[PDB]
């Protein structure tokens, strides 16, 4: 938020304090487009990270269904060996399976 995007300064007050209306609007629109572009970039990266988190959470849900609520015959789905049981524990923003 400290970039000027090809304007005289990044502060709106300094543009408004010494330029009159047409020049000031020309300078202000550059900052508006740059800041709106920064917000769009943030939202796009949030969408991609949310897709990855959703895939991980779907895998965790099917793991708790097939390994805590039953005994799975799938190889290496739950542990290293022949699966007997599983227990869940809560973690900050996540889950831990024993």
């Amino acid at each position: 938020l400290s970039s000027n995007f090809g304007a005289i300064s990044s502060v709106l007050n300094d543009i408004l304090s010494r330029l009159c209306k047409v020049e000031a609007e020309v300078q202000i629109d550059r900052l508006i487009t740059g800041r709106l572009q920064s917000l769009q970039t943030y939202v796009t990266q949030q969408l991609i990270r949310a897709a990855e988190i959703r895939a991980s959470a779907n895998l965790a849900a099917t793991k708790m269904s097939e390994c805590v609520l039953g005994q799975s015959k799938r190889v290496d789905f739950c542990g290293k060996g022949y699966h007997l049981m599983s227990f869940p524990q809560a973690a900050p923003h996540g889950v831990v399976f024993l």
């Binding site: 988190i53 895998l59 542990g79 923003h93 889950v95 399976f97």
Partner: peptide, 30 residues
Amino acid sequence: ISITTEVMPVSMAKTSVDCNMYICGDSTEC
């Protein structure tokens, strides 16, 4: 008999933005 741990992420932080405070702040002209 062996017990193995496995850690999996589930959620992330929910966030919100306000365009008017981020872009313009307190200016009424902007």
